[PDB]
């Protein structure tokens, strides 16, 4: 009586694990080369279905991470190698001793000062201390002037050049220099070869979205209770393409996120305690960074005929520094409250036991926030900021770190290890002129780690890759498979 028959055109699907197409609006380089134009269609429809969603175990987020990284690698690949520059450089001794690259025992320094010196210093748009790049506590940049002999395309002819390095970019040979001209090399040359990131990478924003190929579709959670891992999502929204993603790579605080909503959300890894905390846009949190001084850039033709961008500054500017604006105190209070009330949190009772904290260790890639402003990477020591936003009783943090400020000192570094799991060291060309960037702050990257009902430790993290799971994350890719089978009586003849 009941035969299988074939039902074609059936509204059903299964998990897909395939590549997606990218589409963009910025078509200056990589866009025209690799991506479809953005169609402008951001519409979506809802279904009365239940589906399982997981931000960490996703194919959509996995492609975002690997694709951003891969387009970086294919952009740098053809640029000039700097191994011809790994020669002894002759550096000003007072500068290498002053900033700790080399040693001297003839400085016999001794300081007597007031110990009751902690101050509170607030800055905002309407202030001359910002316009003139001089706020209480800001020091000089720490740039070291070094000379070296470099050969261009004439081969049997060479010239000496003036290159000023940031102090963190040099190693410097130590011991028995009783004169001048210390002997220095680039910090990461010898274990590897440094390549210059010549094709304007990071000088502008990279934004793109993913589109499903024919036969595939994207499902998204449209709940408010989505916490990264949700086995039964009741509000499932269907679309053909994802929202636009901002491929921003910064540690501690994520900038310019697309998921900027009037709500604090905390995604949680299902199997771990690593989380991405969005911030409530209601408070207009913003970070305005400046790199003081007017730079000169001097292209140098080296051996192969490719050009390297040198930095003959011949000056002594103030430190790069950053100013935090918006209602930071209140945005942080909401984060602490959101954690206390969260489904996966079984820790403390009060927000007076919940604190933001730096990761420990002596490793600069975690102890300092890294922010990319138009091509120059800016590591920033944030103790002043944290003391202020948390309104901490500092007291015993040692005299330079005991201040409460809404700005922090920072220091430019040109040889940066790639953010992805590569380990490659690249050189960032300097930008000419002065630099200013004004970013929104949309997320906090941190682990939540408590072992008792007192002290929660929101520990800032440097895994930049976790940020891509806030940009997407709520998407699932599915295959439409419209063939069904079901018992029925209607067989042919």
């Amino acid at each position: 009586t009941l035969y299988v028959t074939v039902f074609y055109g059936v509204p059903a699907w299964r998990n897909a694990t395939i590549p997606l197409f990218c589409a963009t609006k910025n078509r200056d380089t990589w866009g025209t080369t690799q991506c479809l134009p953005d169609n402008g269609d951001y519409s979506e429809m809802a279904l009365n279905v239940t589906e399982s969603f997981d931000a960490w175990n996703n194919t959509v987020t996995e492609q975002a991470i690997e694709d951003v990284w891969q387009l970086f690698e294919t952009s740098i690949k053809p640029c000039v190698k700097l191994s011809p520059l790994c020669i002894t450089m002759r550096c000003n001794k007072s500068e290498t001793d002053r900033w700790g690259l080399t040693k001297s025992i003839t400085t016999t320094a001794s300081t007597t000062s007031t110990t009751a010196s902690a101050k509170v210093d607030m800055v905002n748009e309407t202030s001359s201390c910002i316009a003139q790049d001089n706020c209480t506590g800001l020091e000089q940049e720490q740039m070291i002037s070094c000379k070296f002999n470099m050969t261009g395309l004439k081969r049997d002819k060479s010239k000496e050049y003036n290159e000023t390095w940031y102090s963190a970019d040099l190693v410097c040979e130590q011991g028995n220099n009783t004169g001048n001209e210390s002997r220095c090399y680039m910090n990461h040359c010898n274990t590897s070869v440094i390549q210059e990131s010549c094709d304007k990478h990071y000088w502008d924003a990279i934004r793109f979205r993913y589109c499903a190929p024919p036969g595939y579709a994207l499902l998204r959670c449209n709940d408010t209770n989505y916490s990264g891992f949700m086995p039964k999502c009741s509000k499932v929204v269907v679309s053909s393409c994802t929202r636009m993603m901002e491929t921003q790579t910064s540690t501690w605080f994520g900038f310019n996120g697309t998921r900027a909503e009037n709500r604090t959300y905390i995604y949680w890894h299902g199997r771990d305690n690593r989380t991405i905390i969005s911030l409530n846009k209601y408070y207009n949190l913003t970070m305005k960074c400046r790199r003081p001084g007017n730079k000169t850039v001097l292209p140098v033709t080296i051996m192969s005929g490719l050009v390297f961008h040198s930095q003959p500054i011949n000056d002594r500017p103030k430190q790069a520094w950053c100013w935090f604006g918006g209602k930071w105190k209140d945005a942080i209070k909401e984060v602490k409250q959101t954690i206390v009330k969260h489904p996966r949190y079984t820790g403390t009772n009060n927000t007076d036991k919940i604190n933001l904290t730096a990761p420990g260790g002596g490793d600069p890639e975690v102890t300092f926030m890294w922010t990319n402003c138009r091509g120059e990477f800016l590591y920033c020591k944030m103790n002043w900021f944290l003391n202020w936003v948390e309104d901490r009783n500092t007291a015993n943090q040692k005299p330079k770190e005991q201040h409460k400020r809404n700005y922090v000192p920072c220091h430019i570094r040109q040889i940066i290890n790639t953010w992805h799991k590569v380990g490659k060291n690249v050189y960032l060309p300097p930008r000419e002129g002065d630099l200013t960037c004004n970013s929104t702050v949309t997320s906090l990257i941190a682990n939540i780690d408590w072992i008792d009902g007192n002290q929660t430790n929101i520990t800032m993290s440097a895994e930049v890759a976790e940020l891509y799971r806030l940009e997407l994350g709520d998407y699932k890719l599915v295959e439409i498979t419209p063939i069904g089978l079901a018992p029925t009586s209607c067989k042919r003849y």
Partner: antibody
Amino acid sequence: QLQESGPGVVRPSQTLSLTCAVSGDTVSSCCFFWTWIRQPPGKGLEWIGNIYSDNDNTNYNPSLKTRISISKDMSKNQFSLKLNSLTATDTAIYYCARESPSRGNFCYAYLYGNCPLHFDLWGQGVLVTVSS
Amino acid sequence: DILLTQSPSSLSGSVGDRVTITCRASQGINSYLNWYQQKPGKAPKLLIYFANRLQSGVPSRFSGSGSGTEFTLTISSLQSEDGATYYCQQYDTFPTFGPGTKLDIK
């Protein structure tokens, strides 16, 4: 903790109301639901509805979709039912519960199907008869 | 909805014996099944939750396990005080409760 209350006898086509007080705690406490079930004499248990303490959101048994309403009042530490269009089959013991979630590594959202949820705390129960 | 049923509907044994109740579902429940113990004249109380954990305050003689469409409640040694109606609750969606089973005392 949970003390219910209301008329023992109501009439057909009227609206029944039941109000439960929370003692030693409030109705605004985080991550709890104030729920009601019914137990008609001689029958098992039936869930009828749920109001979430941290929001104005409710969840009702579809069989009473147009008949049941739940609200809370933080100034009284009380929550209550209204059941309209009463009939003979609505005779039941009405009970309250807190439905505490098990917060932790097994709770992802305070939703049915996404968090262990159980009625650890129960009230006394009010028997309501619908009659002329 | 999920239809939750129970068996035996009525069972008994002596004080000191081994007693079990089985709950079944028409749909799988991942683990979201609760057990309640209701004695006549009283509100039900939680006995076991999330198909595996004993509710604090409940004697250690009570235990259970289960997954999918089959779950079990066990009393390792029946007490004279355990006569009660035991109910299963699924809360995978819009909780419905099963019919309940009775344990009497012999």
